[PDB]
Design a protein around this ligand. Structure first.
Ligand SMILES: N[C@@H](CCC(=O)N[C@@H](CS)C(=O)NCC(=O)O)C(=O)O
Ligand SMILES: N[C@@H](CCC(=O)N[C@@H](CS)C(=O)NCC(=O)O)C(=O)O
Ligand SMILES: N[C@@H](CCC(=O)N[C@@H](CS)C(=O)NCC(=O)O)C(=O)O
Ligand SMILES: N[C@@H](CCC(=O)N[C@@H](CS)C(=O)NCC(=O)O)C(=O)O
Ligand code: FES
Lengths: 115, 101, 107, 111
């Protein structure tokens, strides 16, 4: 469990930074679909990690719980930074804060320093 | 951190501690099971607390479980509804409870 | 097996009218919980049917889809009349239309 | 009662308006998956994005009354009901999908 708890945490962290936007999700969840709706509405591209379609989904989820303090889906990352869940994303949209998050993350990622 | 301290204190404040939400069917199931078998337990309903989401987040950080119920016996992490139900079917729950009492 | 579907429709109709407020639900669903929480906070009493806990749950949902136009959960009935899902109840309540319905399923 | 009868009629018309019709929502992962699969196997398909239509909700509700399916995608081949993303994917795994598409391709319009 030890070298394998480190493994799952390692894998979750990689996934979380693996795309400009990353949504940890379950295929059956409407809260997850609402986040997807809000991202699509703002014209963002994003990666979805459906945890229930992964054999290590369970372990990835508890790694996310330990790391982020959010053990529920959706668990949203923008530019590798923890955003929050569905309530969070709805709030960012409602206050017009979702677009700047996306654009600021993209600006940071564009043509980064080699050193 | 404040929430992490409160959560740990809470989890140890009785022989059995169930972190819960009033609307949760899985919490109801554990609660029903625990009282069937005659156990006394403390319940902390997170949805009735101002700091409830911080407390839940502390529990995720500490236990790796981000959902309710989150069940403790003798200050030790047991798990959720499924964990408790399935232990009890395979006779592992009454020992633990008796030991903690 | 249109008769597993007639049986499910029958069982569904009986369920829906078995209490003044009925919530077809799944135990794990946050949208279902949002409705349960709201009904409790307004002081209503409800019965819940957790479809994920029944062996004929999927058949009841098709029945509900065929019958009501809604195959998703939550599916909320007041006084035996289909009201809608989480969004509907929350919007109705925000327009003070939820309370009158709840009162009549008592009065 | 007049409104319910019309939306059912429109649903049924759209369902048969192309050799393959996918009732969809733009953000839905199952819809994305079903569209990628149909593309993969060379299907000619028309997508109806319910969230892009003001009567999307009534259309979805018509689809549920009629098909008993309350979710997107809702897929039709040759005017006939197939089901959702899981159903189409299972057809494909059974190699039943290409033959259904070839059947529907016998004539340009659905008979
Ligand atoms: N407040 C959270 C609620 C998220 C939530 O309740 N997620 C549920 C599903 S609807 C969940 O993850 N349950 C455990 C699981 O499905 O793994 C948010 O806004 O994202
Ligand atoms: N498999 C879990 C299911 C628990 C679960 O899904 N709980 C829901 C409440 S119904 C939850 O905590 N959802 C996220 C939330 O309410 O914050 C267990 O056996 O305990
Ligand atoms: N707009 C609906 C959302 C309902 C929804 O998306 N429900 C999901 C679960 S969180 C569902 O029933 N999915 C299909 C299924 O479980 O069979 C509402 O407001 O109630
Ligand atoms: N098992 C179904 C699942 C489809 C599904 O869950 N769709 C979600 C959208 S991603 C849905 O329709 N939710 C209710 C709604 O959008 O009204 C299939 O394979 O097609
Ligand atoms: S499941 Fe229904 S909301 Fe997550």
């Amino acid at each position: 469990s030890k070298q394998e708890l480190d493994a799952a945490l390692k894998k979750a962290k990689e996934l979380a930074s693996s795309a400009p936007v990353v949504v940890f999700s379950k295929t059956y969840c409407g809260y997850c679909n609402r986040v997807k709706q809000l991202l699509t509405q703002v014209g963002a591209s994003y990666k979805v990690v459906e945890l229930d379609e992964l054999s290590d989904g369970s372990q990835l989820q508890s790694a996310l719980a330990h790391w982020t303090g959010r053990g529920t889906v959706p668990n949203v990352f923008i530019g590798g930074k923890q955003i929050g869940g569905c309530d969070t994303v709805v709030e960012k949209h409602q206050r017009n804060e979702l677009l700047p998050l996306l654009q600021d993350a993209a600006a940071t990622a564009k043509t980064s320093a080699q050193l």
